[PDB]
Design a protein around this motif. Structure first.
Motif, mmCIF file in Angstrom:
data_model
loop_
_atom_site.group_PDB
_atom_site.id
_atom_site.type_symbol
_atom_site.label_atom_id
_atom_site.label_comp_id
_atom_site.label_asym_id
_atom_site.label_seq_id
_atom_site.Cartn_x
_atom_site.Cartn_y
_atom_site.Cartn_z
ATOM 1 N N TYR A 1 47.518 40.509 52.988
ATOM 2 C CA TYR A 1 46.815 40.781 52.405
ATOM 3 C C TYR A 1 46.570 40.416 51.373
ATOM 4 C CZ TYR A 1 41.476 41.033 54.252
ATOM 5 O OH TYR A 1 40.652 40.722 54.181
ATOM 6 N N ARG A 2 46.936 41.391 50.146
ATOM 7 C CA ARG A 2 46.894 41.341 48.449
ATOM 8 C C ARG A 2 47.087 40.028 48.285
ATOM 9 N NH1 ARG A 2 49.561 45.060 49.145
ATOM 10 N NH2 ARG A 2 51.569 44.339 48.423
ATOM 11 N N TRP B 1 40.489 33.693 56.996
ATOM 12 C CA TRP B 1 41.929 33.783 56.977
ATOM 13 C C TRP B 1 42.249 35.485 57.697
ATOM 14 C CZ3 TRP B 1 43.946 37.228 53.516
ATOM 15 C CH2 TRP B 1 43.183 37.230 52.101
ATOM 16 N N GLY C 1 25.836 40.140 52.571
ATOM 17 C CA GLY C 1 27.067 41.908 53.573
ATOM 18 C C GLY C 1 25.906 42.864 54.396
ATOM 19 N N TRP D 1 31.993 35.267 56.990
ATOM 20 C CA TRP D 1 32.794 34.420 56.042
ATOM 21 C C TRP D 1 32.681 33.601 54.925
ATOM 22 C CZ3 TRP D 1 32.656 38.293 59.706
ATOM 23 C CH2 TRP D 1 32.321 39.365 59.965
ATOM 24 N N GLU D 2 33.176 34.222 53.540
ATOM 25 C CA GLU D 2 33.606 32.544 52.636
ATOM 26 C C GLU D 2 35.170 32.637 52.880
ATOM 27 O OE1 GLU D 2 29.852 33.042 49.701
ATOM 28 O OE2 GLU D 2 32.222 32.891 48.510
ATOM 29 N N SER D 3 36.008 33.265 53.619
ATOM 30 C CA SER D 3 37.461 32.942 54.479
ATOM 31 C C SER D 3 37.787 33.838 55.716
ATOM 32 C CB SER D 3 37.239 34.267 52.572
ATOM 33 O OG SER D 3 37.775 33.954 51.468
ATOM 34 N N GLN E 1 40.839 33.975 45.180
ATOM 35 C CA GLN E 1 40.245 34.396 43.899
ATOM 36 C C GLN E 1 40.061 33.569 42.652
ATOM 37 O OE1 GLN E 1 37.834 35.814 46.859
ATOM 38 N NE2 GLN E 1 37.318 36.199 44.985
ATOM 39 N N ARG F 1 38.483 30.059 43.559
ATOM 40 C CA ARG F 1 37.097 29.957 42.871
ATOM 41 C C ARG F 1 36.749 29.954 41.576
ATOM 42 N NH1 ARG F 1 37.091 33.133 48.344
ATOM 43 N NH2 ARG F 1 35.696 31.654 49.207
ATOM 44 N N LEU G 1 27.061 39.596 58.217
ATOM 45 C CA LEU G 1 28.019 39.364 57.542
ATOM 46 C C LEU G 1 28.226 38.792 59.254
ATOM 47 C CD1 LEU G 1 30.160 40.615 54.688
ATOM 48 C CD2 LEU G 1 28.973 37.923 55.565
ATOM 49 N N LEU H 1 44.092 37.086 48.790
ATOM 50 C CA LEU H 1 43.367 37.472 48.404
ATOM 51 C C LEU H 1 43.426 37.073 46.829
ATOM 52 C CD1 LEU H 1 41.023 38.961 49.227
ATOM 53 C CD2 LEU H 1 40.957 40.317 47.156
ATOM 54 N N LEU H 2 43.765 37.417 45.837
ATOM 55 C CA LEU H 2 44.541 37.185 44.473
ATOM 56 C C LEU H 2 44.449 35.432 44.075
ATOM 57 C CD1 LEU H 2 44.748 37.174 41.075
ATOM 58 C CD2 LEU H 2 46.724 38.686 41.601
ATOM 59 N N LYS I 1 48.861 43.694 56.316
ATOM 60 C CA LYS I 1 48.418 44.893 55.638
ATOM 61 C C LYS I 1 49.558 45.178 53.858
ATOM 62 C CE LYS I 1 51.167 48.103 56.079
ATOM 63 N NZ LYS I 1 51.569 48.906 54.823
#
Ligand SMILES: [Mg+2]
Ligand SMILES: [Mg+2]
Ligand SMILES: [Mg+2]
Ligand SMILES: [Mg+2]
Ligand SMILES: [Mg+2]
Ligand SMILES: [Mg+2]
Ligand SMILES: [Mg+2]
Ligand SMILES: [Mg+2]
Ligand SMILES: [Mg+2]
Ligand SMILES: [Mg+2]
Ligand SMILES: [Mg+2]
Ligand SMILES: [Mg+2]
Ligand SMILES: [Mg+2]
Ligand SMILES: [Mg+2]
Ligand SMILES: [Mg+2]
Ligand SMILES: [Mg+2]
Ligand SMILES: [Mg+2]
Ligand SMILES: [Mg+2]
Ligand SMILES: [Mg+2]
Lengths: 117, 60, 206
Positions: free
Chosen positions: C28-29, C21, C8, C17-19, C36, C39, C11, C32-33, C25
């Motif tokens: 993104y939410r 994309w 961190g 980053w590991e993402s 995650q 992973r 970065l 992300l979910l 607004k």
RNA sequence: ACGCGUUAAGCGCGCCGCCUGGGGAGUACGGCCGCAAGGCUGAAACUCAAAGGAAUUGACGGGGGCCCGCACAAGCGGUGGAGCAUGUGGUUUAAUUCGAAGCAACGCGAAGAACCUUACCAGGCCUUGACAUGCUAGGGAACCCGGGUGAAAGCCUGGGGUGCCCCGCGAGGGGAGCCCUAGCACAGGUGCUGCAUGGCCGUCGUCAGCUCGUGCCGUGAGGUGUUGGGUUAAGUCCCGCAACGAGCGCAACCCCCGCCGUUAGUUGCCAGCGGUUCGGCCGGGCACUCUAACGGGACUGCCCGCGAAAGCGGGAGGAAGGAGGGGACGACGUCUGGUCAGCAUGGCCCUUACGGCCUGGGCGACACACGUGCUACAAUGCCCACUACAAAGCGAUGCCACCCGGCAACGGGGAGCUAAUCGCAAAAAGGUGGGCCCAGUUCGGAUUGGGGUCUGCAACCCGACCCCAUGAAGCCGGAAUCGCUAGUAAUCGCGGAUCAGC
């Protein structure tokens, strides 16, 4: 080198001043890369830390020494005069005659007169 | 209570004002940034790892 | 309780980053979910292979998912029997077309999260907690690193009082931004509670 | 060991005195001596596992020397007084859920408690459970629409319903999905233990430190290096030195702000010239301003003085010197610090209840005490009107221009904007004019009566806003005590997060 032009700002002093000291102390010491076979010491009392190490390692100790010093821990002693530039000279040189003269082809009595006086 | 409740908050309820946020990880009511669904904690965590894209240590 | 995460901290530079994309607004939410629980599933059913990074990209209903591993053989299956099962498992939650590269980490003793995992693995098989560390560091220095450091938390060897073992070699300059210090963390759920394994590998520079 | 060392504590001989764990105890007893005070000689019972000596590393000192920091001093503004907001202590409660405790708890977890939230209480309820994976078994197997009852949850119900495996049969029975009830493995617990833990954090402290390798010194713990002299913000550099180096730190490498250049033209412009309903609005132009990417620029490089050197004082040039200004960044370790209530997690405890669901109340109590704050107590001020100072962020379950209705909050309509384009947006202090005239006041806006608006199922306990009335304490605050060294303090407004609203 190509890096007499580059290197970050504060490293053509940082690195180049490190080379200054290394130049200052390790001028003559840069040569031997295994322990020597003997050491020739001018004032073994002045140079006591050196003698110590020699003996510790069983390296013999040649020395020009004088009333200053303890002879018993000099293996090969030359009772003389650790101070006079004359004495140091007379002896140090003629000993380096033998050194080349054990290999043939001696040179002059040497550049060994600073501004001698 | 924090299982029967992660469940309850997903159910659509009588009245939309009974509704609310929750850190979709770290399953949690308070400081829940709506742009992420993420509790300030379970968030600083991802933010550090690089798992939140373009998100970065701010310094000005 | 001091000290920032070294990733961190880096970065913007000497670690990316590991993402990767973009999103507006209100996507993104969810991007992300998904990102995650991905992973969450990969890491869980893929421990054997030993996965370092789980890189991810997007460009509208397609996903990159460039998983890095020590043992590619284990994700594939002799031919392509597992890599099929996984592409299939993915799209059942990810309502999009899941692409999926696979990468060999050429030297796994320089992948910090592998080194962590390694040591964590040993600890769960009641190994010599202090030598594990000692060895691990060695292994990492042995595979040509500039420095390393490993830390294990407490209840070392099931002892009643929590303690903290560490060991390290060469340089691990955590304050230099231009360092490149792969960091990694592994758990270690034992009969007498969790231990925590951290691992630091110095390599890089300008 | 400290030290001794021809003035031995060295090497030897002779002769004397003495010791034999600590306490009891130089006590008791006896004897001798003494005018007396007392002295010499000198036990035991009992009792301890030490009592000691020297040296090491620390820590401490109302020891020394050197030095730092808004530490004090010098200043400017505060708190402690008043009202109110808020957090906490206490008390009260059916409950006032839990945590946090000097610094480093107390506008803290809470970046949003009316129901949600919610972990508390009271009542009505469900129990294989709101959620995961499987097993044993009759019943139905996708599903749809009501009714009774109740505060809701739930519970008692009446209908619509026949799709698919299978063809094994041309009369359809076999627990394939799926859905039920009855058992079973289990779920669930914000129950307890931060003194069983991870993680993350706080903290000494952004303090100038903490170490290692090998060598050297010591019987040893350890020492040296890292002490010393100079210097710095710095264990920063320099010079010395039985040390020579290194690592974690310091600094630098990264972001923001100062100056300039390159690249780029739906934001900039009469800068130039042209037209302008005179609004950069219109063709036109990137010059400038800006926007955002990439470079440049500063090095004690240059000059004077001091110095062995590092570096110190001063000067020029330069937008900017000697760390230019603000961030990010937290050594080994310390506190058995913080959190099991974010999460994760070892153990112990609850399983028609320590789980669940609901409605309602509670977390908002109020005789009190404290912390942090707001608004004040006025004329360097208050009120009203006019008047461009400009500067980070938010906005399509949204920001709402503009018209109209209402004193207003707000309600009708309604354009633009996925936003350098349109909106929130008025910045306020300031400036110009006018009022008040030192009054508990045209200062102050607590409290309280009344009428409204909005969000929301719902605003009694418990919301914010508007309007009328009502105008409380308060005249600068006891002892104590806080912040700040410059674009700082002081003061003035502006935005955001959470968020229906607050
Ligand atoms: Mg809400
Ligand atoms: Mg002596
Ligand atoms: Mg005794
Ligand atoms: Mg002593
Ligand atoms: Mg001492
Ligand atoms: Mg003062
Ligand atoms: Mg007060
Ligand atoms: Mg508790
Ligand atoms: Mg603790
Ligand atoms: Mg802890
Ligand atoms: Mg506690
Ligand atoms: Mg020795
Ligand atoms: Mg240093
Ligand atoms: Mg110093
Ligand atoms: Mg630094
Ligand atoms: Mg404790
Ligand atoms: Mg309730
Ligand atoms: Mg409260
Ligand atoms: Mg007055």
């Amino acid at each position: 080198s190509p890096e007499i032009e580059e290197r970050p700002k504060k490293e053509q002093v940082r690195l180049k001043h490190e080379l200054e000291r290394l130049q200052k102390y390790l001028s003559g010491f840069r040569l031997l890369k295994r322990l020597p076979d003997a050491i020739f010491v001018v004032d073994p009392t002045k140079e006591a830390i050196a003698v110590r190490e020699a003996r510790k390692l069983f390296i013999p100790v040649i020395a020009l020494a004088d009333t200053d010093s303890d002879p018993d821990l000099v293996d090969y002693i030359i009772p003389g005069n650790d101070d006079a530039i004359r004495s140091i000279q007379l002896i140090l040189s003629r000993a380096v005659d033998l050194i080349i003269q054990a290999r043939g082809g001696v040179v002059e009595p040497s550049p060994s007169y600073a501004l001698v006086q | 209570a924090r299982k029967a409740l992660i469940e309850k908050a997903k159910r659509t309820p009588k009245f939309k004002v009974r509704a609310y946020t929750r850190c979709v990880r770290c399953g949690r009511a308070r400081s829940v940034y709506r742009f992420f669904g993420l509790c300030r904690i379970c968030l600083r965590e991802l933010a550090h790892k690089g798992q939140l894209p373009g998100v970065r240590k701010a310094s000005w | 309780g001091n000290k920032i995460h070294p990733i961190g901290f880096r970065l913007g530079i000497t670690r990316d980053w590991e993402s990767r994309w973009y999103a507006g607004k209100k996507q993104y939410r969810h991007l992300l979910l998904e990102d995650q629980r991905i992973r969450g599933l990969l890491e869980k059913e893929l421990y054997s292979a030993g996965l370092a990074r789980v890189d991810i990209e997007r460009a509208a209903d397609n996903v990159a998912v460039t998983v890095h591993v020590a043992k590619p053989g284990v994700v594939i299956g002799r031919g392509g029997e597992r890599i099929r099962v996984l592409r299939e498992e993915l799209a059942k939650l990810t309502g999009k077309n899941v692409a999926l590269n696979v990468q060999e980490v050429q030297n796994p003793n320089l992948s910090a999260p592998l080194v962590a995992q390694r040591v964590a693995e040993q600890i769960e098989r009641r190994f010599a907690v202090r030598r594990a560390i000692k060895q691990a560091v060695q292994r990492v220095m042995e595979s040509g690193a500039k420095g390393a450091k490993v830390i294990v938390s407490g209840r070392i060897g099931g002892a009643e009082q929590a303690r903290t073992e560490w060991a390290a070699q060469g340089r691990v300059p955590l304050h230099t931004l231009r360092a490149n210090i792969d960091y990694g963390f592994a758990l270690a759920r034992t009969t007498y509670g969790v231990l925590g394994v951290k691992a630091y590998i110095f390599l890089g520079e300008v």
